[PDB]
Amino acid sequence: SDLAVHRLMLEDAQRMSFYRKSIEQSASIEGKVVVDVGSGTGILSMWAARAGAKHVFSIEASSLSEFQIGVVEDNDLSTKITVLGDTVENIIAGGVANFVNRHKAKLGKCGVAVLLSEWMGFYLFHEGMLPSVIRARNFFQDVNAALGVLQPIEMIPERATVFVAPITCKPYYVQRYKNFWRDVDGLDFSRYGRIEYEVYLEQPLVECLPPLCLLHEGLSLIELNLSTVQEEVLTSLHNTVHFDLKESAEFQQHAREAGSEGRVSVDGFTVWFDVSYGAHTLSTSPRSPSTHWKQTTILLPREARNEELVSFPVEGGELGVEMHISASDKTLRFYTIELEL
Amino acid sequence: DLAVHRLMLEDAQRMSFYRKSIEQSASIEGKVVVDVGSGTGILSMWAARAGAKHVFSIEASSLSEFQIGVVEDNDLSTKITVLGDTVENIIAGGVANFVNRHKAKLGKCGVAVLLSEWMGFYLFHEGMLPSVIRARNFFQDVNAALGVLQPIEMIPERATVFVAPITCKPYYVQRYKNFWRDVDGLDFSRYGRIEYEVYLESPLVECLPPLCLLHEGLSLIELNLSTVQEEVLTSLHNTVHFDLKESAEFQQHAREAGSEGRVSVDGFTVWFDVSYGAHTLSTSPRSPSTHWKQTTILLPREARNEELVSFPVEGGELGVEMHISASDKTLRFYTIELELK
């Protein structure tokens, strides 16, 4: 069921606020034509109409589209929103000219000004909808060119960013395992905690991490301009970042707890994303309210971890990692993440 | 494995029942106890702490190896013997072999108490009662060979399946209607009905709001754990009649119906209590939630939609025959069927 997932977008205050504010405070909506790709409940389309859009094309391939038409009617907006119950890909296959001829009156003199969408998946790409958004963007820009309009469509969100940070797993182990298992009605069950923890780590980990796990605030790994980004880039996203732990407040926090002759080991890397539009940002960092997306953690091998093979003295040092986020097939909807020190 | 047993350890009601029952028993101190399906071994360790002469801890999963370490960790190794096998395999070994292997620990006492948490969903489903029955019979045979005739004390000593008619409307409201009613000024009610309508597809394992109850609940099945034999487990069935005229839970809804309105029945919810001495572990909707929740069996959608089973404000009488039947010969998996009277 599609209402399954959509509910938690509507349940998430950060996601709701980001889109509400971006739409209700943008300059290209009132009197303009908007496209909502993968509109599900149609919340974004309805916000756009309410905000005074000339017209909204709501694109939703699932059977939920029939019901969205009903909800649009229930909120008295059937005149401002047309639901296209089809995939972006099939609409494109029908062609520009056919689309123009059919929707000529709604398109108006200025064609499509804004493209709204929530396409993000885990670590921004995994199970995401980004390719459809890109294909939709190019399609509607050709629709616009057919009408003599070359103004680039404004994208919401307009930019996205993948962030990465090294982590220590000890704050996670402490808070999630060690403190529960230390005392069970006066019995020492710590052995159970260690077992539960080691094996949970072996079973990419999508979980909310305690902020204390961070050995560094995080660095930008990949940045996308949603107006210009093309599909070809999505095959393999890769970059190399270098953490200066000597300058990191997060690292020093741990450096303190290890004493003055202590060591700080790295257990892995956590990955999250932000998207933005204008002054607004929706973030999935461990320091932000959690979301369905949580954070994605990639651990170093158990031996590297257990033997503390990647560690630093209490005054810090430098750490470099090359990360690859790679499509596992041609849909560009499913990804893996690998890293190399 | 461990994930499950953590939930037991995380449930205050369950922990409290067993701890208080073990403390209340007059039959533990100086005597031998068997803990069937001991998991973390928490029950065995409580029994040891309560002064048992010795404890046989029976756990067939890989946890057994780890429970041996936790026992040693708490200096209980001379008190607890962990048998890393199934009840059935230990039984297959025979009375003589068991007597021989554990002669010194058995002494002249034999086994005086059998501890276990065997309960499944609505007491039978995915539970291990048959294994507990076999264990009890086997240890009473070991006892006879030892000259001991006293019946083994079972904790819990009794179990009861409870059933009540329900209305789903307070569920609809609290889980669906309240949420979808207003989404930032928008009426998304149509989605809530879709979501609720489909979700009602059979038996529903879910925590139901007590407000759903149309009667406080009636005993359907009662087991004496010392005496119950396997043969009764094939088809457990009975008929109960609910007096809705004298029911406070029904008046709750009678009041809100109006003098001309009616109160309709959407189905029946099933739960269980187990007890020992003055203590009771309950999984009723009015009790703190537990992993077993409650199990709800709904009437057909037509009977629910056309309110075919309904009562005037004065109430009336509702009869139901319920069958809880084994779906195979293991007696661990069950189906629930009902018929209105």
Author numbering:
A (entry chain A): 25 to 227, 230 to 367
B (entry chain B): 26 to 226, 229 to 368
Provide the authors' own sentences about this structure as they appear in the paper.
The set of protein arginine methyltransferases (PRMTs) is a family of enzymes that catalyze the transfer of a methyl group from S-adenosyl-L-methionine (SAM) to the guanidino nitrogen of an arginyl residue to produce S-adenosyl-L-homo-cysteine (SAH) and methyl arginyl residues. TbPRMT6 is the homologue of HsPRMT6 in T. brucei with 31% amino acid identity. The overall monomeric structure of TbPRMT6 consists of three parts: a SAM-binding domain (residues 36–181, blue), a dimerization arm (residues 193–225, yellow), and a β-barrel domain (residues 182–192 and residues 230–368, green). The structures of TbPRMT6 highlight several structural features that are distinct from those found in previously characterized type I PRMTs, including four stretches of insertion, the absence of the β15 strand, and a unique dimerization arm.
Structures of apo-TbPRMT6 and in complex with SAH (SAH-TbPRMT6) were resolved and refined at 2.20 Å and 2.35 Å, respectively. The superimposition of the apo-TbPRMT6 structure with the SAH-TbPRMT6 structure revealed that the active site undergoes rearrangements upon SAH binding. Unlike the significant backbone motions observed in CARM1 and DOT1L active sites, cofactor binding primarily induced side-chain rearrangements in TbPRMT6 active site. Without SAH, the guanidine group of R39 of helix αZ and the imidazole ring of H318 of the THW loop point out from the active site. The comparison of the apo-TbPRMT6 and SAH-TbPRMT6 structures revealed the fine rearrangements of the TbPRMT6 active site upon SAH binding, which is critical for substrate binding, as demonstrated by an ITC assay.
